[PDB]
Design an enzyme around this catalytic site. Structure first.
Site, PDB file in Angstrom:
ATOM      1  CD  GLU A   1      30.965 -15.433  87.603  1.00  0.00           C
ATOM      2  OE1 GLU A   1      31.945 -15.668  88.341  1.00  0.00           O
ATOM      3  OE2 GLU A   1      29.984 -14.756  87.971  1.00  0.00           O
ATOM      4  CG  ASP A   2      37.328 -13.134  86.887  1.00  0.00           C
ATOM      5  OD1 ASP A   2      37.152 -11.928  86.614  1.00  0.00           O
ATOM      6  OD2 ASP A   2      37.443 -13.551  88.059  1.00  0.00           O
ATOM      7  CB  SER A   3      35.735 -16.038  80.392  1.00  0.00           C
ATOM      8  OG  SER A   3      34.464 -15.479  80.116  1.00  0.00           O
TER       9      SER A   3
ATOM     10  CG  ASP D  48      38.827 -17.659  88.960  1.00  0.00           C
ATOM     11  OD1 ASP D  48      38.529 -18.868  88.988  1.00  0.00           O
ATOM     12  OD2 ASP D  48      38.877 -16.955  89.988  1.00  0.00           O
TER      13      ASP D  48
END
Ligand SMILES: [Mg+2]
Ligand SMILES: [Zn+2]
Ligand SMILES: [Zn+2]
Ligand SMILES: [Zn+2]
Lengths: 137, 263, 45, 49, 63, 113, 66
Positions: A1-3, D48
């Site tokens: 999740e975009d880490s 994010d």
RNA sequence: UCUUUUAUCGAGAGGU
């Protein structure tokens, strides 16, 4: 999740590591013909409504010197306002922000437009990546 | 039972084939060499005067990353098991630097060779920074223009590569096993062919290529290993290897001591 | 009283808070305070 | 605040009644919260920023 | 004040912070709070672990 | 502001044993060992070796969370042997291997120079 | 700003290969051969030196305030 | 044995 997963050794050797400055300012407002405000150090005997942080880091004219470490709410500019007519002055300081930890870098002292003093201070600190900082391609 | 066959040996790097052992013993040896070889490095800096165009912790960082010679660092004690106050002599090495520019035209370059060892426990072989040749100047610390004095005093302590990535001795260590792919531990992506679309690892001649009429055995294990070790000059590769094995043995001996005395 | 440095002539002097704001040399009017006299450590980390 | 206390846990803007749930506490270092990824579906959340 | 070593400069002689400069930020009793100079953190330390600066060098808690 | 001090990844405080053992109960002759301040290096070096002796039936380890520092290990032999003795034997064997390797490496080095 | 000391990924010291790199760039060599002559085979240490921006040259020409 | 101060109105630049 975009880490992501960043390497510790590269952070140690100097990857994405940054400097962070900041500056403050204060001057002298005039109220009476002889009634003004003077940069100095207040003592408990004369002035009133002191603030809490330590005053022991000011030199004698009211400006902290470069090379001193300042942390939470360390008073950097002691300035007094005279009481309208013992125990006859009121404090009007300027504390460092309650969430900063920095080394004082450079102090400036000059005159304003009218003809009174005029001070600036410049603190700096170092910042290093850690769990939470944001990055982008 | 284990064996060693050095392929390339010289001053500061070794290339060898480690054979007839297990896997996690060679791997654990590698991790031990990257993680636990106690070396020596600068730790504290007390700047007496700085008037250059560089912030302090920038300089203190660059000094923080400098390789020093540490052949006799397995005798000096740590920083936490000396009973003195502040520091003494059996716990640190003291360096000092002092440089200034003189004139109007010029740009003096403050290098690392200008570090002068002052006081350290003797007579042991520590303190001096690593030099390549008999003339080379080395690392470039700072630069000074007209009237910009720099004078500092540094402490140097012993540490390992788990507390900061500066006490680390080796750079990158090459490691591989099974070049021709015979254990089928991996699979190869391809568009047309999985043979005419891949490089050949430099060691694909030491072992023989598999026969296209071979069946598939299923009892073999990764046996012959290929590894290469580099250094930065702070140590010499043979000392890195021996000290690694020594440290691992000491660790196992410690655990065995705990198991025995726990009775 | 305390050290002060000019902006221009690089000339050190001192003040007792009674003077107005210039150096005794060229008289430039943007003066900086000097370094303090304590001892400053670091971590090299 | 210690281990195993039940704290309420919320994200703005909450819509359906699943955006406010009570979790059990677990103390951890560093400066950020932690979630099991399986609870990223009622919160409409992603890591994010 | 409520003690004679607050705000005075200190050197640490034991522990993981040995050799580091600091300032006594709070010295309520036995357990002091020294504001380290080197990283921006104030640590808990026993008063036995400190050297205080005085007229002649770093003295222990006999100042 | 909230960072763990690095040296806490290999320096042991006073009120923490380096090694703690607790016997599991769901099956007989199986024990659980708890190691402080150790990682994959010691754990694997032990695991691949214990996973060979023709009298140990089940050995495994795991690291619970990579931000802390420890690992736990499960050991189960057979009825004749007690697991602790077997663990000690494995330690001794590995030490012997390392010694031999060092010797032969030094010989090959002094010949190669 | 100025050449680093260690690398960023492996740690091979590249703080003494800037003067020789510039001097080999005066002689008309190429970056590929000027790095093949400085012994840099892994392209991480190569990218560390090939893409540096030397800024201190500017930071000096401002007369000293001290 | 405590305690311990952050104007106000308005405008803009931003993050999900
Ligand atoms: Mg989002
Ligand atoms: Zn000592
Ligand atoms: Zn002047
Ligand atoms: Zn590299």
């Amino acid at each position: 999740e975009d880490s992501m997963i960043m390497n510790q050794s590269s952070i140690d050797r100097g990857l994405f590591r940054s400097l962070f400055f900041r500056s403050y300012m204060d001057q002298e407002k005039r109220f009476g013909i002889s009634i003004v405000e003077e940069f100095e150090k207040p003592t408990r005997a004369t002035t009133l409504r002191l603030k809490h942080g330590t005053y022991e880091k000011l030199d004698e004219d009211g400006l902290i010197a470069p090379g001193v470490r300042v942390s939470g709410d360390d008073i950097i500019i002691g300035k007094t306002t005279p009481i309208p007519p013992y125990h006859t002055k009121r404090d009007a300081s300027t504390p460092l922000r309650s969430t900063e930890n920095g080394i004082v870098d450079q102090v400036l002292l000059t005159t304003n437009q009218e003809g009174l003093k005029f001070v600036k201070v410049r603190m700096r600190t170092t910042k290093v990546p850690q769990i939470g900082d944001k990055f982008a391609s | 039972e284990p064996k060693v066959n050095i392929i390339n040996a010289q001053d500061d790097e070794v290339e060898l084939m480690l054979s007839d052992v297990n896997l996690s013993l060679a791997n654990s040896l590698r991790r031990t060499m990257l993680a636990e070889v106690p070396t020596l490095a600068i730790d504290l800096v007390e700047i007496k005067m700085n008037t250059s165009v560089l912030a302090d912790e920038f300089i203190s960082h660059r000094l923080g990353l400098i390789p020093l010679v540490s052949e006799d660092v397995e005798e000096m004690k740590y920083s936490r098991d000396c009973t003195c106050e502040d520091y003494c002599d059996e716990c640190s090495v003291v360096l000092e630097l002092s440089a200034r520019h003189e004139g109007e035209e010029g740009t003096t370059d403050v290098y690392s060779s200008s570090l002068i060892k002052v006081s350290g426990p003797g007579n042991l072989n520590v303190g001096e920074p690593v030099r390549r040749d008999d003339y080379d100047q080395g690392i470039l610390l700072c630069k000074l223009r007209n009237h910009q004095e720099l004078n500092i005093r540094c402490i140097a302590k012993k540490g390992i590569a788990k507390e900061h990535a500066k006490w680390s001795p080796c750079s990158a260590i090459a490691f591989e096993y099974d070049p021709h792919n015979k254990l089928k531990h991996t699979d190869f992506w391809f568009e047309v062919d999985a043979k005419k679309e891949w490089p050949d690892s430099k060691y694909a001649t030491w072992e023989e290529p598999p026969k296209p009429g071979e069946v598939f055995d299923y009892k073999a294990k990764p046996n012959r290993f290929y590894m290469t070790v580099e250094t930065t000059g702070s140590l010499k590769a043979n000392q890195v290897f021996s000290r690694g094995i020594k440290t691992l043995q000491e660790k196992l001996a410690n655990v065995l001591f705990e198991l025995e005395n726990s009775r | 009283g305390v050290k002060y440095t000019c902006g221009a002539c690089a000339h050190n002097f001192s003040l007792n808070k009674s003077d107005p704001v210039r150096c005794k040399e060229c008289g430039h009017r943007v003066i900086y305070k000097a370094r303090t006299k304590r001892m400053i450590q670091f971590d090299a980390r | 605040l210690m281990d195993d206390d039940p704290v309420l846990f919320n994200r703005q803007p909450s819509l359906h009644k699943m955006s406010m749930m009570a979790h059990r506490v677990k103390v951890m270092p560093y400066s950020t919260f932690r979630l099991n990824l399986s609870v990223t579906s009622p919160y409409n959340a992603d890591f994010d920023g | 004040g409520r003690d004679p070593t607050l705000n005075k400069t200190v050197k640490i002689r034991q522990g993981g912070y040995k050799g580091k400069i600091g300032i006594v930020k709070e010295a309520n009793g036995d357990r002091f709070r020294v504001e380290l100079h080197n990283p921006n953190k104030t640590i808990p330390i026993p008063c036995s672990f400190l050297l205080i600066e005085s007229t002649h060098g770093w003295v222990p808690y006999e100042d | 502001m909230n960072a763990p001090d690095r040296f806490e990844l290999f320096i042991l405080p006073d009120d923490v044993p380096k090694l703690k053992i607790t016997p599991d109960s769901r099956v007989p002759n199986c024990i659980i060992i708890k190691f402080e301040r150790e990682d994959h290096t010691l754990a694997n070096l032990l695991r691949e070796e214990l996973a060979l002796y023709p009298d140990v039936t089940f050995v495994a380890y795991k690291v619970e969370h990579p931000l802390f520092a420890n690992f736990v290990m499960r050991l189960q032999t057979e009825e004749g042997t007690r697991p602790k003795q077997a663990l000690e034997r494995a330690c001794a064997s590995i030490i012997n291997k390392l010694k031999t390797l060092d010797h032969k490496f030094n010989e090959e080095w002094n010949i190669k120079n | 700003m100025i050449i680093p000391v260690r690398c960023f990924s492996c740690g091979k010291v590249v703080g003494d290969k800037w003067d020789a790199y510039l001097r080999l760039l005066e002689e008309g060599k190429q970056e590929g051969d000027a790095l093949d002559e400085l012994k840099l085979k892994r392209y991480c240490c190569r990218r560390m030196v090939l893409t540096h921006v030397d800024l201190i040259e500017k930071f000096l020409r401002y007369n000293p305030l001290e």
